[PDB]
Amino acid sequence: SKVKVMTVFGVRPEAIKMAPLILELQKHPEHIESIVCVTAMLDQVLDVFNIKPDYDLDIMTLNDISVRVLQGLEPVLQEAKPDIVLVHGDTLTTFLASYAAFMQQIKVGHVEAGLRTWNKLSPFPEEMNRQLTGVLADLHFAPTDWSASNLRKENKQDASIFVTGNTVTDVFQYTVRSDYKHEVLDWAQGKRLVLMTAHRRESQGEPHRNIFRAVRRIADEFEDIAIVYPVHPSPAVREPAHEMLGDHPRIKLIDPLDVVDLHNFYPHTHLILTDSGGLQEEAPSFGIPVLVLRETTERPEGIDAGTLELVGTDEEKVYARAKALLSDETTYARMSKAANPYGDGKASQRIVSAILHSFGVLEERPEPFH
Amino acid sequence: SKVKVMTVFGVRPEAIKMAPLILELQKHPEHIESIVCVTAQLDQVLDVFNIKPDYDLDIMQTLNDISVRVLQGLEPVLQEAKPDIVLVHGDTLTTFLASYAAFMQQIKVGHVEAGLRTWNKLSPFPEEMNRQLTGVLADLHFAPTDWSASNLRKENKQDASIFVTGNTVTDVFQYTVRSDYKHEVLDWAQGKRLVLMTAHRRESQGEPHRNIFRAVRRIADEFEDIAIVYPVHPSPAVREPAHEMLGDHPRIKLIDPLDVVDLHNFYPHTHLILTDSGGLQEEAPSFGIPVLVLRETTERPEGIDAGTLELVGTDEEKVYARAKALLSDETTYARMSKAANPYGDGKASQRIVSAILHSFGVLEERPEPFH
C-alpha cells in the first residue's frame, strides 16, 4: 500500500496549475497512488497533459453547489479512502473538498496557500474560501515567503507551512516547444517583440485611451520593436483600439491568445505591458520585464523583487516607463536578471517531497524555495 | 423597519446559553425584530424561558448528512426571513453551518462565545475546527473574556470586530433561580456548610474516584458543621464505589444528578464545590463559591488566573488538604469567594445587543467592554 493522494479541482485555471503536480505525483509509484477527482468540460486541458480523471462529479446558487459538491464527494472519499486530499487556490470547490475531507478525518494539503486581501467583500467569495481552506489544511504549500507570513499572522504552526513556489511556473515544460511557429512571431521576426494585454473591465474608455496614446508614441519612436496586442473582445475595447492603434506598421492587433500560444510567445518577447495577474506571475520565468497598467496590485512579491513595476494608466507615465525599458539597458537587465519570486519550475517536486515527509516516507524536510 | 436578528441553536446546552440573549433582544422592539431558528438532531428548555421558535428544521447521521441537511433547511428560512444578522453560539457543527449559510447570502454573522482555543484540531474534535471555521465567517466576535479576545487577535481578527461581553451563562440565573425554592436535601443541609461535589469525567472513573472518595470521607468524619451533597454519575462504575465508600456516612447525602434549574437553585445555599465539571467552574463563582477542581489541568486559564478556581487533582492527600484549608481558614475562602467571576457579571446579553445596535449604526458610541 502507498500514500493515496487525491487531487480535487474543477475549472480551467485550477486544472492547468494542478496538471504538473499530478504529473509529478505519477513519478513516485513506489510511494504514491495518484487519484484525480474533477467537480466541473475540463477534459480539454486534461487531453493536453494526458490526465485521466478517476472521478468526474458533474455540478452543471453558492448553497446549491455546496450541497452538490458535498453529496458527490462523500461516496468518492469512502470508496477511494485517500490518505490526503490536495486542493488548489481559492474556488468554492477548494473549500468544499477540504471540508468533505475534514468530515472523514482525511489529511488536507492546500496548493497556493496564504494569499490574502483581508477583505471578505473583495474578492468575494475567494478571500473567505482561502481563509476557510486555511483552517482545514494540514499542509500549507505557500508559493512565497509573503504567503507563508500571511499564514503565520493567522497563528498557523510553522512546521505545517512549506514555501514551494507556485505550480504555474511548472507548466512551461509541458506547454513550451521549439517546433512552435506563429504568423505573429514571423511578422515580429527581426524586432524586439513588445507584448501588451488590457482585459480589466474597469479601465475601459479614458484609461485605455491614455495607454493607447502612450503606445502609439512608443510605436512611432522605436523602429526596432513590434507591438503584439491580443485585444479584449468587447466593442468598448476593440473599437477604440482599432481606431487609435489599427493602422501602424509596428502594431499587430490580434484575437486573444490561448494559454499554449501565450506560453510559446514568452521565449520570443522582450517587454510586457499588462494588467493581467497571470502574465505578471509567469513572464519573469523568461527574463521578461513587466510594466503593470494599474495603480495597485493585490500581490507585493513581484514589486519588491523588481520583476514588475506599477506604471498606472496615465499617458505620460506609460510612455516614459516604456521608453526607459526600451532604451536604458541598465533598468532592463535589472528587471530581466531578478528571478521569478513566484517559483523555480520545481514547485511540484517540493510539494510531493512535503507530502512524502509528512507521511514519514522522507525523514528529511525538503529545502523550501528562496 | 428594524435590525432583524435571527438566533440559531441546536442542542439543549446551546439553547440555555442563547435563551437569555433572545429575552434581551425582545426588550428592544423599537430597534430589533427578534427571530428564533431551531436546527436540532429541547421542548423543556424553550418552555422554561417562554421562547417561541419562528422556524425549525426537524433534522433526522454523518457530519456530512447534518451538513447537507442544515444548508438545505436554512436557504429557504434566510431567503424568507431576510435577517440583517445571524447569531450563532459556541463550537457546534450547526454554529459553523448556520454561519456558512448566512455568508453565502451576504448576511452578517455574530458569534456568541467566540475565541476558545486549544490550537489542537484533534482535541477537541470536531469543536476546535468548528469554532475556527465560525471564527473566519463571523463579522462580530462576542468574546467571553480578554483571553478569548487575545486568541482571536493571534488569528489576525480586526480589533473593532471583537467585543468582550462576558459569557451569557452568567445571564441565566435571573430566570432559573427562585427565592421560593425548596428541596429535601437543602432541608437536610439546613444549619450546615453545604459542600456540593460532582465527578462526571469518564477519565477518573476507578482509582482517582477511590482517592477522592477517601479524601471526602476523612473531611466528612472531621467537620461537624458540614453537609456533603454528591449527585452521583448514574453509571454503576461510579454509583457503586460511591454508595460502597460514602453511602453509610450521616454527613454525606448521595442523590441522583440535579436538573440545571435545581443545580442553579442549590448555588445560593452552597459553601464550597469539588468538581471536574467545566459547567460548575463557569457558574458557581457568580455566587462567590470557591471551586476545587478534581483535575491535574483544565482547558481555559481565566478561572485559575482569577482566584475563583484551584486545581487540586485526584490524589487523596491534596484533595483532603485543599478541602480542609478552604473549610478551615477564611482569608483563603475569602480570597476565592470575593474575586469577580472572570466569565461574566450577568450582563453579557445586554453588551451583545449594544454591540449589534452599534454595528448597524443605531448606537453611535462603541459600548464599554466587560471588565
Author numbering:
A (entry chain A): 2 to 41, 46 to 65, 70 to 379
B (entry chain B): 2 to 42, 47 to 65, 69 to 379
Reproduce the article's own wording on this structure.
Crystallography on recombinant PaMnaA conducted in this study yielded an unliganded structure in 2.2-Å resolution, confirming the predicted catalytic and allosteric site of the enzyme. The crystal structure was solved at a final resolution of 2.20 Å in space group P1211 with two molecules in the asymmetric unit (AU). The PaMnaA structure contains two molecules in the crystallographic asymmetric unit, both displaying nearly identical conformations with an overlap Cα rmsd of 0.32 Å for 370 equivalent residues. As expected, the overall structure of PaMnaA forms a GT-B fold, with both the N-terminal and C-terminal domains adopting distinct Rossmann folds connected by a short linker region (residues 173–200). The space between these two folds forms an interdomain cleft containing the active site. In the absence of substrate, PaMnaA adopts an unliganded conformation corresponding to the “open” state observed for these other enzymes, where the inner surfaces of the binding cleft are exposed to solvent. This open state is believed to facilitate substrate entry and binding within the cleft. Key residues involved in substrate binding in other UDP-GlcNAc 2-epimerases are conserved in PaMnaA (R13, L18, E135, R139, H208, S285, and E291). Additionally, residues D99, E121, E135 and H208 of the putative catalytic site are conserved in the PaMnaA amino acid sequence. Overnight soaks in 10 mM UDP-α-d-GlcNAc produced no change to the resultant crystal structures, with no bound ligand observed (data not shown).
